[PDB]
Amino acid sequence: SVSKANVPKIDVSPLFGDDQAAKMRVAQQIDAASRDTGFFYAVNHGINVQRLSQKTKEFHMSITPEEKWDLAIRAYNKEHQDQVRAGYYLSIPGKKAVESFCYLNPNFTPDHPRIQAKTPTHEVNVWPDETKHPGFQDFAEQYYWDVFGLSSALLKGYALALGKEENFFARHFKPDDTLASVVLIRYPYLDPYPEAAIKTAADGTKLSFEWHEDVSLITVLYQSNVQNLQVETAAGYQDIEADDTGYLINCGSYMAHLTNNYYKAPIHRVKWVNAERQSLPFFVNLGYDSVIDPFDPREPNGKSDREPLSYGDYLQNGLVSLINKNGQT
Numbered sequence: 001s002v003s004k005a006n007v008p009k010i011d012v013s014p015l016f017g018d019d020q021a022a023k024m025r026v027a028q029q030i031d032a033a034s035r036d037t038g039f040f041y042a043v044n045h046g047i048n049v050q051r052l053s054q055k056t057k058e059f060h061m062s063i064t065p066e067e068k069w070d071l072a073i074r075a076y077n078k079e080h081q082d083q084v085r086a087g088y089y090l091s092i093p094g095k096k097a098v099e100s101f102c103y104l105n106p107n108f109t110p111d112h113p114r115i116q117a118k119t120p121t122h123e124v125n126v127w128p129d130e131t132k133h134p135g136f137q138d139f140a141e142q143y144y145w146d147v148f149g150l151s152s153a154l155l156k157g158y159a160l161a162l163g164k165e166e167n168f169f170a171r172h173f174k175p176d177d178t179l180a181s182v183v184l185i186r187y188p189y190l191d192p193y194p195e196a197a198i199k200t201a202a203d204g205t206k207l208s209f210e211w212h213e214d215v216s217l218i219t220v221l222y223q224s225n226v227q228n229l230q231v232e233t234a235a236g237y238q239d240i241e242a243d244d245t246g247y248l249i250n251c252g253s254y255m256a257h258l259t260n261n262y263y264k265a266p267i268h269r270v271k272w273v274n275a276e277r278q279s280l281p282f283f284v285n286l287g288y289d290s291v292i293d294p295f296d297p298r299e300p301n302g303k304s305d306r307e308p309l310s311y312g313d314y315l316q317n318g319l320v321s322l323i324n325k326n327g328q329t
């Protein structure tokens with residue numbers, strides 16, 4: 001009764017190479033998907049997603065309550081006032097099923113200028129004990145750079161799709177200052193499943209996370225093979241099929257801002273499914289002071305009335321707004 005959403009599988013491998021016409025043909029596919037449901041699967045992306053899933057499971061299934069408190073963000077542990085973004089987001093048995101671990105740019109160290117300056121949205125990552133989680137930090141930091149590289153390539157596609165030179169976005173997506181984050185989300189199997197963790201949509205659908213747009217330029221998402229996402233279209237909410245070999249890509253509201261809503265941030269939600277599974281987004285955020293001039297590709301002269309908005313302000317306010325709207329995760 002629910003229709004399947006059109007979510008094309010785009011071979012993005014040319015975006016890593018030097019064949020300009022082949023890159024334009026990928027860009028066209030990104031344009032079409034961005035103008036249609038707003039989602040596509042990136043395939044032939046080069047990332048070892050089997051290792052990502054296996055190592056994430058080993059971490060989620062071995063971390064203990066003590067370790068979660070010791071890594072917890074300030075929402076769960078008032079001792080950790082500097083941890084707004086990075087750390088552990090705890091479950092609450094009987095009430096809240098989801099739990100997750102967020103980390104930021106590994107280059108944010110105590111001596112990084114933005115850490116020294118105490119600039120908002122920048123934090124030094126927290127990590128579990130190496131002996132208790134051997135290889136996890138190294139795996140996770142390398143994963144950040146692998147998905148960074150895929151995201152760079154995707155941003156070349158989006159730039160070309162919009163009629164720009166290929167580094168239009170990517171030049172502002174940089175290892176030294178990116179505010180991008182990885183979140184390793186566990187959605188557990190639970191029986192009895194906590195009713196407080198289920199929301200009911202206007203159409204009666206049981207949900208684990210309510211409708212929203214993304215706080216990102218783009219979002220680059222791995223999920224294990226359990227169908228759960230739905231996208232709002234003119235025809236109603238439609239099911240996004242799972243594909244645990246690809247990355248699900250969509251635009252966030254900063255892309256909508258920069259393109260005068262030509263590439264919309266698609267509204268989507270997470271159905272409740274009682275199955276153990278993984279949701280592993282990478283949020284492609286620019287640097288704190290990144291302030292690209294909005295444009296309008298619909299207009300012959302390409303100009304837009306929208307005012308420039310620095311990425312850091314956008315991100316800080318967007319993440320608070322999403323918590324207020326859809327709850328602390």
Ligand SMILES: CC(C)[C@@H](NC(=O)[C@H](CS)NC(=O)CCC[C@H](N)C(=O)O)C(=O)O
Nearest residue numbers: 085102181183209214221270279281283329
């Ligand atoms: C829809 C999925 C991406 C996933 N949802 C999510 O990850 C939701 C909506 S995009 N994301 C957030 O809450 C924003 C996390 C931001 C992160 N702490 C950071 O500091 O950068 C889910 O499976 O629930």
